[PDB]
């Protein structure tokens, strides 16, 4: 399977994270135009997947408990908090798509806080952390699931707002451990 190839899984991860960031920070992704990361085009399927992730992210953006905990995160040096939260969400050795979405949402939120200073740098740095965690911890599971396509089934039509309560809850819980 082509979507089961590690290269395709990484590329879709990068494109999903990029689109998440370029929604609330605008073109240039970061800031400095000579350092902007080009938006790599999405095929129809990846666009459907990005649009779904946008709506789930918008729902998470209205979860005030989650937003309070995200806001508490120091974005000067976010290495420690990012990796502790990422590890914590997967510490039971299990995987599900809600945790993946929670991770990519969290990564994108951290970048948009670092919107203060060094955005193209924090964008690259946090994107790198996220894709490294994807490759080291999640890629095999995504391969065994047949690619990114399975994400949509986790939220279901007409139940995705219910599912997002549980997504917010796992991310909120991890951030509480590091509060």
Curated annotation (Swiss-Prot):
InterPro entries hit by this protein: Bcl-2-like_sf, Bcl-2_BH1-3, Bcl-2_fam, Bcl2-like, Bcl2_BH1_motif_CS, Bcl2_BH2_motif_CS, Bcl2_BH3_motif_CS
| Result, substituting residue 64 to D/E | Strongly reduced interaction with MCL1, BCL2, BCL2L1 and BCL2L2. No effect on cytochrome c release and subsequent apoptosis triggered by etoposide
Show where the record puts the motif BH3: 49-63
**Entry protein name:** Apoptosis regulator BAX
- Tell me the GO molecular function terms: BH3 domain binding; channel activity; Hsp70 protein binding; identical protein binding; lipid binding; protein heterodimerization activity; protein homodimerization activity
The text of the family note is: Belongs to the Bcl-2 family.
Q: Where is this motif: BH2?
A: 140-155
For this record, the Gene Ontology CC terms, alphabetical, are: BAK complex; BAX complex; Bcl-2 family protein complex; cytoplasm; cytosol; endoplasmic reticulum; endoplasmic reticulum membrane; extracellular exosome
Note the SMART domains from the entry.
Answer: BCL
GO BP term (any one): T cell homeostatic proliferation
Share the record's PTM remark: Ubiquitinated in the absence of XRCC6/Ku70. Ubiquitination promotes protein degradation.
Name of the gene encoding the protein in the UniProt record: BAX
Question: Which positions hold the covalent cross-link Glycyl lysine isopeptide (Lys-Gly) (interchain with G-Cter in ubiquitin)?
Answer: 118
Q: Which Pfam families match?
A: Bcl-2
Q: Has the keyword Membrane been applied to this entry?
A: yes
Q: Which UniProt keywords are listed? A: Acetylation, Apoptosis, Cytoplasm, Host-virus interaction, Isopeptide bond, Membrane, Mitochondrion, Mitochondrion outer membrane, Nucleus, Transmembrane, Transmembrane helix, Tumor suppressor, Ubl conjugation
Effect upon mutating residue 11 to E: Reduces interaction with BCL2L11, homooligomerization and triggering of apoptosis
How would you summarize the oligomeric state and partners of this protein?
Homodimer. Forms higher oligomers under stress conditions. Forms heterooligomers with BAK. Interacts with BCL2L11. Interaction with BCL2L11 promotes BAX oligomerization and association with mitochondrial membranes, with subsequent release of cytochrome c. Forms heterodimers with BCL2, BCL2L1 isoform Bcl-X(L), BCL2L2, MCL1 and A1. Interacts with SH3GLB1. Interacts with humanin; forms fibers with humanin which results in BAX conformational changes and sequestering of BAX into the fibers, preventing BAX activation. Interacts with SFN and YWHAZ; the interaction occurs in the cytoplasm.
Tissue occurrence: Expressed in a wide variety of tissues. Isoform Psi is found in glial tumors. Isoform Alpha is expressed in spleen, breast, ovary, testis, colon and brain, and at low levels in skin and lung. Isoform Sigma is expressed in spleen, breast, ovary, testis, lung, colon, brain and at low levels in skin.
Tell me what organism the protein belongs to.
Homo sapiens (Human)
Is Cytoplasm tagged as a keyword?
A: yes
Please give the superkingdom of this protein's source.
Eukaryota
Q: Which intervals of this chain are the motif BH1?
A: 88-108
Q: Which residues cross the membrane?
A: 162-179
């Amino acid at each position: 399977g082509g979507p089961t190839s590690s290269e395709q899984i990484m590329k879709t991860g990068a494109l999903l994270l990029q689109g998440f960031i370029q929604d609330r920070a605008g073109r240039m992704g970061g800031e400095a135009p000579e350092l902007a990361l080009d938006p790599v085009p999405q095929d129809a399927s990846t666009k459907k997947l990005s649009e779904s992730l946008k709506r789930i992210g918008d729902e998470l953006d209205s979860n005030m408990e989650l937003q309070r905990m995200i806001a508490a995160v120091d974005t000067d040096s976010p290495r420690e908090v990012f990796f502790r939260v990422a590890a914590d969400m997967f510490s039971d050795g299990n995987f599900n798509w809600g945790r993946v979405v929670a991770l990519f949402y969290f990564a994108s939120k951290l970048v948009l806080k670092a919107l203060s200073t060094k955005v193209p740098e924090l964008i690259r740095t946090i994107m790198g952390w996220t894709l490294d965690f994807l490759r080291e911890r999640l890629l095999g599971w995504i391969q065994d699931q047949g690619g990114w396509d399975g994400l949509l089934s986790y939220f279901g039509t007409g139940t995705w707002q219910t599912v997002t309560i549980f997504v917010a809850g796992v991310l909120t819980a991890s951030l509480t451990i590091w509060k």
